[PDB]
Amino acid sequence: ARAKAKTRSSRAGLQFPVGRVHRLLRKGNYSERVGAGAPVYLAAVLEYLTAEILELAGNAARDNKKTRIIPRHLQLAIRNDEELNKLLGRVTIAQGGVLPNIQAVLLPK
Amino acid sequence: ARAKAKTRSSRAGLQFPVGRVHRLLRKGNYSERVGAGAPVYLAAVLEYLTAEILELAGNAARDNKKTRIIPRHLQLAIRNDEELNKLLGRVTIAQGGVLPNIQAVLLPKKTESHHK
Amino acid sequence: LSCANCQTTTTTLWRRNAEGEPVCNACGLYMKLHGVPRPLAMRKEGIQTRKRK
Amino acid sequence: KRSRKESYSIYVYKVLKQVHPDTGISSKAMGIMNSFVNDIFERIAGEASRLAHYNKRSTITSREIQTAVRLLLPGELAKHAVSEGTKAVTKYTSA
Amino acid sequence: KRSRKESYSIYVYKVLKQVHPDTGISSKAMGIMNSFVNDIFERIAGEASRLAHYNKRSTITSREIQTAVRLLLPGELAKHAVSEGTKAVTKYTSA
Amino acid sequence: KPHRYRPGTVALREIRRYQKSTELLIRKLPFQRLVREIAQDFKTDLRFQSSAVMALQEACEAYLVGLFEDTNLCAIHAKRVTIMPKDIQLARRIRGE
Amino acid sequence: KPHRYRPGTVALREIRRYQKSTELLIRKLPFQRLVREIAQDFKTDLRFQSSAVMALQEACEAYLVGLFEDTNLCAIHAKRVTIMPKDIQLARRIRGE
Amino acid sequence: KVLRDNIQGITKPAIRRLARRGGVKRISGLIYEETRGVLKVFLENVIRDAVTYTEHAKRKTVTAMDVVYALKRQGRTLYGFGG
Amino acid sequence: KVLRDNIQGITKPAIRRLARRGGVKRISGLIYEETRGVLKVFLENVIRDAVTYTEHAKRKTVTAMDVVYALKRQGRTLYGFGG
Amino acid sequence: HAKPPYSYISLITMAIQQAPSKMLTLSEIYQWIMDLFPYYRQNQQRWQNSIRHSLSFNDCFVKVARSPDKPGKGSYWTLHPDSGNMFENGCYLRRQKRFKCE
DNA sequence: TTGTGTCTCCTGCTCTGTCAGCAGGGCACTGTACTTGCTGATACCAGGGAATGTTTGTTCTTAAATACCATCATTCCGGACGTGTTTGCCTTGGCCAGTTTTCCATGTACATGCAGAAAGAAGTTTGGACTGATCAATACAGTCCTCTGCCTTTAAAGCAATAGGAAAGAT
DNA sequence: ATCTTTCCTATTGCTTTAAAGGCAGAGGACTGTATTGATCAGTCCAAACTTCTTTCTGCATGTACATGGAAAACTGGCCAAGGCAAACACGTCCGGAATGATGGTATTTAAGAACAAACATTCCCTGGTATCAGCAAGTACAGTGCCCTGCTGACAGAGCAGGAGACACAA
Ligand SMILES: [Zn+2]
């Protein structure tokens, strides 16, 4: 009989879905075939980036004495980090606002 | 007996290759299936665009008293046409140069005094 | 101006024959190379087939 | 043997002879025209693939190409290109 | 019921609980994170497909994903993501 | 004598206020009317989802805020503090618009 | 006295000359050495096709010419004719680089 | 039914608020018409693509996904409305 | 064999010629070092991607197509090198 | 030769009036005076400077340009219409109530 | 016989002649740089012939798109009330634009020499073709369990009110 | 430096609304086997790169002179900021209804797959016409100095009107 099913995420030690990523790769017309390790690698990378942004955004939410992350905290996390700001340079965050920044010349004497 | 072959480009009245365009659409992983009229439409559009650019480039070549189109003439044709300039704004043409353009404020003025 | 030999009104580089009258580039080169005038049958010609705005 | 390299040179030359019968083109200009045709093909094909994906269509049809042309080309280029494509498809269907 | 519409919400929430056990997230923020994951997926997958096409390969392998990550992510993010992906593939290969 | 803040004080106050907040700064109803007016030229009798109009407003306000940041930089480059149409034009020209 | 053009005349002459032509303006061999020096930090014992180095030089010169055009616009904005580091910095800032 | 001059609905206070969020301290009097023109051009460019996407789907309602795709096609990716 | 200080090979007259093609009349004395730095950054960014493409192909020679792809993915599409 | 009784202002006014088109320039005025007054063939610099000073100072004369650049090298001076007649009734030498715009 | 209007001569204001200086602007001359026209050299593109791999034609299968209907959800229009925002006006302050000055940091031109460009040659080294081998992905069927929709509970955020500290502006 | 005014932040209490948690099912992931086609490994070779040597300059470096552009200082007026008051148009919600989007069924059209023929495209090879190189006239334009033409500060000198002295007329 068939052995007990184990998700590929559990085999790879990931929280993100390896199976869904593989299916989306197959259905996206990216290539004729998809390797076994490609969805694992891609899911691991996506999980890492999500964890990075969530860590920074949780820090920003804590700085505001807030318990829940809102778009403002995601914007603050992204634009205060050089790497993420470079990755997401051309992206607009709805309800994210902007970083507070006044040019020094505009301040009073 | 089997009817004599006739190219789809001739069937559509085009100079560009309908069969090659269809093959490239199939091989490029753009979609699972490709309609019969899709390569015809695409070949016609590509032919129209290249005809437009070649006409403008030939006019540019004639203005320079030349007979062969060179990259400079393609650059002049593209950048002098607002729509082609919009389409190919982010494109660099090797050995194309730039349009002659000097800001008006950089040109010399006339001084009241004519002495050294 | 026009070529004294074949009478094309446009050429890439006007040249002059032994008699001093103007000749177009192809006829001048053909004369200097072969010693014979360039045939008008050898001359090519064409008419535009496509146009737009 | 050695692999052959296909290109659009002969077709670009035929179009040139149509528009300017007495004009020629240098090899570098022909290479630029090849780059241009490949670039525009890739833009239109990618946009058509995106359109089919958004609407959950499996097949890229002439309608997808027409919409991609309307999206990519600006202004009068889009109108004239749509007219040319429609004319070509009608001629192909009638024959 | 309405037609099912999948998303990354549960996985983003699990990662959040892993990183900030006591922090929550609003629905708008979760939508932004879902858009972010879709965007990065599309970027990496498109770059990998282009890499496979350039080399005349039919399959996208973990090497294509690694090269795409190197090309797309900047600086330290690239190497950290490469380490994470290699570690995950090593774990998976041991079954 | 009535109290009055000197010029530029309330301007800096408003800069801080609106850079701290995130709500939309254009009134929703007139922006929706503008969107429908522009859309009627492309197609008649167009329905609109509310979220479509909200996405349009978010994109427009983000674009305008970024443009004003570039315009402010261009103005300061000319040793001014007042933004002028020439500043917007230069910013648009360099951005490639 | 010997003839001597006033400042800016030969500069305008050179502008017209180099906007009329198309040849590459950087010397080929030192640019090739620079390319190899930069490449050696990413991988050792690399080889380059000649066309690859030519493509790199073409792209770099096009990029620098465009950047100088934007820098010139920025300098003109501040009522100057001399380009300065601040002009390049503003141009690269607005371009998003 | 028909709407005529709604561009003026983008009032001077709204433009001033947008400038303030952009960090601007002092605003010239001619900025407002310039901003209205720029905004109208941007909106036309986005809405044309959104309506094209709507028409291709044979729909008569412009959805948020149409706007998101139109913005993404122009290098202005928007998060928070996709899906 | 090792190359050390070839950035200075981008001489002052070369930068002057590049500026002249850009329409610049007068050039500050400090422009040359800034231009060298900017060119260095641009070349590093392009060559990094080109060498990444070369390594993925398991080749030891950087081909023109590697450069073309590297430029294309940075929004710097180049015609005339087999694109 | 004896100095003419006429003053420079009267001479200039008469030269302007007698022209076919009521128009003359400084060079044409010089030619006319050379023709019809042999007295002024000496002291050339003196009377040239005097004529220039008088023409620049007197408000009854107003300058007019040349439209298609003409032969050039000068400008055209016309009598101000509001001047009327000032030297009428034999008063060529010294005028009364000098014309003024203000 | 004596006082005042009118005629004659001297003096002062008007206005014109004469010096002198500095400015604009037109025009002539010298010199440098670019363009045009011609001839001769060369190089590169057009045209003709072999082969190969790609397109076209025909048939069958199948699945993707089409037409009709139903229904439900979701968008449009109108109406009503409250009040926050917009518009217009007035006051004034400080920022932008114009003008002047100085000097330093750029442009122009000359002279020297050095390394870049081009050609030749040799070495070498590696990118791609070819063959066989192997291994990893696809396809199919059957199992089952993870994720999404629906519904309920509660705590994080929003709103209102108050009080204290910070900062701006005037004296 | 001190006092008044305004704004902002921080704290506390109520509530409301949005997120977290629980449950059902179905569609999508997982397991196992056979097929097969993609990829890997080793060999070879030719062509494309790298390296070294020689000439020959054209181009870069360094120098000196002096021009003019950038920056600083000053002034003022006019354009924008701040604040008050009335109106008005937004925001919220509620209801009716018309529309359009989704889903399901019958079906009809079109695309994929397979196989063979042949024909269009690529590569290879030759001439001849465009393009490049060099020289020499011709043209255009910059830089400079001279002259005419304008305007203004300054003085000095004839013309002619007005006041003073003498004659003739009125009282
Ligand atoms: Zn001829």
mmCIF file of C-alpha atoms in Angstrom, chain J residues 5-102:
data_model
loop_
_atom_site.group_PDB
_atom_site.id
_atom_site.type_symbol
_atom_site.label_atom_id
_atom_site.label_comp_id
_atom_site.label_asym_id
_atom_site.label_seq_id
_atom_site.Cartn_x
_atom_site.Cartn_y
_atom_site.Cartn_z
ATOM 1 C CA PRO J 5 22.233 134.395 -42.698
ATOM 2 C CA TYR J 6 20.383 131.111 -42.159
ATOM 3 C CA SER J 7 20.819 129.217 -38.908
ATOM 4 C CA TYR J 8 21.566 125.499 -38.843
ATOM 5 C CA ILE J 9 18.050 124.683 -37.615
ATOM 6 C CA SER J 10 16.472 126.594 -40.499
ATOM 7 C CA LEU J 11 18.871 124.978 -42.976
ATOM 8 C CA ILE J 12 18.022 121.483 -41.717
ATOM 9 C CA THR J 13 14.290 122.222 -41.787
ATOM 10 C CA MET J 14 14.470 123.568 -45.344
ATOM 11 C CA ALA J 15 16.540 120.578 -46.474
ATOM 12 C CA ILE J 16 13.967 118.191 -45.001
ATOM 13 C CA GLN J 17 11.061 120.103 -46.555
ATOM 14 C CA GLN J 18 12.560 120.414 -50.048
ATOM 15 C CA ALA J 19 13.201 116.675 -50.419
ATOM 16 C CA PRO J 20 11.023 114.806 -52.961
ATOM 17 C CA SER J 21 9.672 112.545 -50.189
ATOM 18 C CA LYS J 22 10.233 115.002 -47.302
ATOM 19 C CA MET J 23 12.995 112.649 -46.128
ATOM 20 C CA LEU J 24 16.756 113.034 -45.776
ATOM 21 C CA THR J 25 19.579 111.547 -43.723
ATOM 22 C CA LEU J 26 22.661 113.229 -42.293
ATOM 23 C CA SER J 27 24.774 112.288 -45.315
ATOM 24 C CA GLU J 28 22.176 113.671 -47.732
ATOM 25 C CA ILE J 29 21.961 116.873 -45.675
ATOM 26 C CA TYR J 30 25.751 117.152 -45.892
ATOM 27 C CA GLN J 31 25.608 116.643 -49.657
ATOM 28 C CA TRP J 32 22.877 119.279 -50.026
ATOM 29 C CA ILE J 33 24.751 121.889 -47.991
ATOM 30 C CA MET J 34 27.935 121.086 -49.926
ATOM 31 C CA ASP J 35 26.023 121.655 -53.161
ATOM 32 C CA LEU J 36 24.304 124.939 -52.314
ATOM 33 C CA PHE J 37 26.722 126.620 -49.835
ATOM 34 C CA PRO J 38 30.396 126.919 -50.860
ATOM 35 C CA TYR J 39 30.963 128.818 -47.594
ATOM 36 C CA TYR J 40 30.918 125.671 -45.435
ATOM 37 C CA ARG J 41 33.650 123.865 -47.417
ATOM 38 C CA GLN J 42 36.095 124.962 -44.709
ATOM 39 C CA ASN J 43 35.672 124.270 -40.991
ATOM 40 C CA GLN J 44 34.297 120.870 -41.986
ATOM 41 C CA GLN J 45 34.741 119.234 -38.580
ATOM 42 C CA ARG J 46 33.363 122.333 -36.853
ATOM 43 C CA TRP J 47 30.103 122.522 -38.779
ATOM 44 C CA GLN J 48 29.736 118.729 -38.801
ATOM 45 C CA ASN J 49 29.916 118.638 -35.002
ATOM 46 C CA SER J 50 27.605 121.653 -34.780
ATOM 47 C CA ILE J 51 25.019 119.999 -37.039
ATOM 48 C CA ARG J 52 25.195 116.756 -35.062
ATOM 49 C CA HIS J 53 24.796 118.574 -31.737
ATOM 50 C CA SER J 54 21.888 120.664 -33.026
ATOM 51 C CA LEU J 55 20.122 117.651 -34.541
ATOM 52 C CA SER J 56 20.517 115.628 -31.342
ATOM 53 C CA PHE J 57 19.457 118.519 -29.096
ATOM 54 C CA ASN J 58 16.474 119.968 -30.981
ATOM 55 C CA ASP J 59 13.223 118.098 -30.313
ATOM 56 C CA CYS J 60 11.554 119.105 -33.598
ATOM 57 C CA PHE J 61 13.494 116.287 -35.330
ATOM 58 C CA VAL J 62 12.680 112.617 -34.677
ATOM 59 C CA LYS J 63 14.561 109.592 -35.992
ATOM 60 C CA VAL J 64 13.125 106.796 -38.143
ATOM 61 C CA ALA J 65 14.745 103.499 -39.107
ATOM 62 C CA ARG J 66 15.131 101.774 -42.489
ATOM 63 C CA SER J 67 12.824 98.802 -42.977
ATOM 64 C CA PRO J 68 14.705 96.448 -45.391
ATOM 65 C CA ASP J 69 18.062 97.736 -44.064
ATOM 66 C CA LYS J 70 18.438 100.057 -47.148
ATOM 67 C CA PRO J 71 22.010 101.091 -48.076
ATOM 68 C CA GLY J 72 22.372 101.560 -44.318
ATOM 69 C CA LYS J 73 25.086 103.277 -42.296
ATOM 70 C CA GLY J 74 22.830 105.825 -40.645
ATOM 71 C CA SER J 75 19.245 106.643 -39.751
ATOM 72 C CA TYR J 76 16.490 108.859 -41.146
ATOM 73 C CA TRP J 77 15.393 111.998 -39.277
ATOM 74 C CA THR J 78 11.957 113.517 -39.897
ATOM 75 C CA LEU J 79 10.476 116.849 -38.862
ATOM 76 C CA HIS J 80 8.088 116.563 -35.930
ATOM 77 C CA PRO J 81 4.590 117.433 -37.274
ATOM 78 C CA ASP J 82 3.683 119.437 -34.153
ATOM 79 C CA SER J 83 6.513 121.907 -34.851
ATOM 80 C CA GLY J 84 4.535 123.741 -37.518
ATOM 81 C CA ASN J 85 6.469 126.694 -38.918
ATOM 82 C CA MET J 86 9.054 128.396 -36.691
ATOM 83 C CA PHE J 87 11.254 130.395 -39.097
ATOM 84 C CA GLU J 88 8.319 131.845 -41.055
ATOM 85 C CA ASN J 89 8.170 135.545 -41.967
ATOM 86 C CA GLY J 90 11.900 136.036 -42.466
ATOM 87 C CA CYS J 91 12.929 134.816 -38.990
ATOM 88 C CA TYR J 92 15.640 132.385 -40.091
ATOM 89 C CA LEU J 93 18.315 133.242 -37.525
ATOM 90 C CA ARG J 94 16.840 133.172 -33.994
ATOM 91 C CA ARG J 95 13.585 131.379 -33.210
ATOM 92 C CA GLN J 96 11.168 132.211 -30.388
ATOM 93 C CA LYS J 97 9.539 129.725 -27.995
ATOM 94 C CA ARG J 98 11.668 126.731 -28.939
ATOM 95 C CA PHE J 99 9.598 123.625 -29.613
ATOM 96 C CA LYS J 100 9.330 121.209 -26.691
ATOM 97 C CA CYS J 101 7.424 117.961 -26.235
ATOM 98 C CA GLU J 102 6.778 118.676 -22.542
#
